[PDB]
Amino acid sequence: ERDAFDTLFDHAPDKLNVVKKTLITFVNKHLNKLNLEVTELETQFADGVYLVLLMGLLEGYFVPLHSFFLTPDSFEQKVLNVSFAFELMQDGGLEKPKPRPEDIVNCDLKSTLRVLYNLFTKYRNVE
Amino acid sequence: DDLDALLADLES
């Protein structure tokens, strides 16, 4: 089950900052268009909102308003948002993400990086 | 070769 992010955190932790930064630049390439900004991947994807918005921007979806919570007020809502974002990733043709939606909400860095990198790999050429 | 591949994407 072991991947490159396991190897990164175990053996090359000083390479984490360039990994963060490249992914931050990628997400803000799209989120800036909505006047939104990510400063830190540790916490700012946990409520599931930006992941949903990002998928809308990347695939050009008509995202149904009643399919996610724009201002989630609980663990469970934040849980429905990430799951819906995962749903939209798979709708575009991506494999089901490795992390459970709860791992994102609980601010697991590896899980956050994995989800964002797989979007980077697919959508790095999208203007 | 996964870490090599990962860093070629994100160190470019």
Neighboring chain A residues of B2 at a CB cutoff of 8 Å: 3-4, 7
Neighboring chain B residues of A41 at a CB cutoff of 8 Å: none
Neighboring chain B residues of A11 at a CB cutoff of 8 Å: 3
Long-range (24+ apart) CB contacts under 8 A made by A43-47 are A43/A107, A45/A104, A45/A112, A45/A115, A45/A116, A46/A78, A46/A104, A46/A105, A46/A106, A46/A107, A46/A112, A47/A72, A47/A78, A47/A81, A47/A105
Q: Is A43 on the interface with B (CB under 8 A)?
A: no
How many folded domains does chain A comprise?
1
The residue segments making up the domain with residue A84 are 1-127
State the structure-solving technique: X-ray
CATH number at residue A12: 1.10.418.10
Q: Distance, in angstroms, between A14 CA and closest chain B CA?
A: 12
User: CB distance B3–A121 less than 8 Å?
Assistant: no
Cβ neighbours of residue A106 under 8 Å, at least 6 residues apart? A46
Structure resolution, Å: 2.1
- Other C-beta atoms closer than 10 Å to the C-beta of A73 total 9
Task: Write the single-letter amino acid at A23.
Answer: L
Tell which phi-psi region holds residue A15, choosing left (phi > 0), alpha (psi between -120 and 50) or beta: alpha
Chain centroid to CA A85: how far? Answer: 8
Cβ neighbours of residue A61 under 8 Å, at least 6 residues apart? A55, A88, A91
